[PDB]
Amino acid sequence: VAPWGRQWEEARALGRAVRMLQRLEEQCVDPRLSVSPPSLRDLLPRTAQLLREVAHSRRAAGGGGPGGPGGSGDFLLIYLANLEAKSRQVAALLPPNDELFRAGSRLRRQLAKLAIIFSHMHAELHALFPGGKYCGHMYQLTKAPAHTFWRESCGARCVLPWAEFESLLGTCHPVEPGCTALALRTTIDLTCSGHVSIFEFDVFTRLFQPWPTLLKNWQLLAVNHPGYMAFLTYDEVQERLQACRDKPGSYIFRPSCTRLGQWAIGYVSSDGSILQTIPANKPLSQVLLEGQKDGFYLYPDGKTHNPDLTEL
Numbered sequence: 624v625a626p627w628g629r630q631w632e633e634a635r636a637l638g639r640a641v642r643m644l645q646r647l648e649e650q651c652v653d654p655r656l657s658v659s660p661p662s663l664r665d666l667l668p669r670t671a672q673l674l675r676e677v678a679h680s681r682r683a684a685g686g687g688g689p690g691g692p693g694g695s696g697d698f699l700l701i702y703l704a705n706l707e708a709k710s711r712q713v714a715a716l717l718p719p720n721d722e723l724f725r726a727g728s729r730l731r732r733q734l735a736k737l738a739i740i741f742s743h744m745h746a747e748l749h750a751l752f753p754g755g756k757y758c759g760h761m762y763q764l765t766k767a768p769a770h771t772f773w774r775e776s777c778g779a780r781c782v783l784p785w786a787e788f789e790s791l792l793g794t795c796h797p798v799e800p801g802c803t804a805l806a807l808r809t810t811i812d813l814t815c816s817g818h819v820s821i822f823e824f825d826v827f828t829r830l831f832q833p834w835p836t837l838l839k840n841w842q843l844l845a846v847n848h849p850g851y852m853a854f855l856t857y858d859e860v861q862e863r864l865q866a867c868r869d870k871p872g873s874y875i876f877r878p879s880c881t882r883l884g885q886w887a888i889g890y891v892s893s894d895g896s897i898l899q900t901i902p903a904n905k906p907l908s909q910v911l912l913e914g915q916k917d918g919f920y921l922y923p924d925g926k927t928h929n930p931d932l933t934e935l
């Protein structure tokens with residue numbers, strides 16, 4: 624059943640993935656590294672177990688629903704190829720005690736980004752295959768307009784190549800070609816696979832609500848805002864805000880890695896301490912404007928001028 628070519632090759636790819644994550648977990652013995660999410664030391668066994676559940680489920684089912692691009696088999700082919708490529712990059716960073724960082728550092732930034740991507744891959748798989756059971760054809764996006772767009776444009780498909788997704792999105796929210804399209808791909812493609820899944824679109828539309836001005840929100844909140852930090856961990860935000868400890872009201876924001884679709888705002892309190900706040904269901908600009916009115920969110924990344932969020 625397409626896109627797989629031979630009978631049992633999806634099963635074999637799943638077995639490969641599990642064994643690869645087992646080895647990769649063996650390479651994470653260093654008691655440094657951290658436990659602060661996202662941590663490979665816990666994500667890797669969780670993701671391996673999820674893949675074991677997927678494998679058992681699709682063996683019993685033999686294996687998926689209708690074949691073709693955008694269904695569960697296609698999703699798994701791309702997902703497992705991506706998982707393998709990212710695992711290879713991680714394995715190249717880790718030892719045969721690991722390399723000392725002590726970051727700062729280019730290398731601990733790379734490793735942190737890979738950890739984030741592993742957190743995103745885990746969440747995507749968990750969202751689309753709860754208990755190992757594919758639900759992409761029934762998946763409900765949180766924002767109703769976004770749900771309606773995805774089902775009218777993409778149908779039952781749970782994943783699309785960037786090019787087709789961009790064409791479909793652009794019938795509704797036009798995407799300026801070139802650098803802007805590439806910045807949008809980078810924001811939306813949480814797993815860094817060059818494909819957009821229904822889960823990634825769910826997260827993007829929750830983060831950059833409200834729907835009618837979606838890409839405007841993204842431009843004002845991500846592209847044009849110096850407080851926005853892409854692919855940053857909790858620990859990295861802490862390290863970054865240390866340098867603004869003497870400037871209460873310094874703040875940065877980032878998509879949470881643990882509560883996907885929600886924001887995490889780190890800021891310097893009037894005590895010089897670093898606090899994190901995760902807003903409710905309000906759009907981000909409302910939380911930021913109220914925090915500016917209240918004195919908490921005055922200096923994005925410690926800079927003097929706070930962008931005006933009234934004007935779209």
Ligand SMILES: O=C(O)c1ccccc1NCc1ccsc1
Pocket residue numbers: 687688689690691692693694695696757760779780781
């Ligand atoms: O994919 C599945 O396992 C699947 C399972 C149940 C219902 C629909 C499904 N997929 C539709 C599809 C396939 C290619 S494009 C759209």
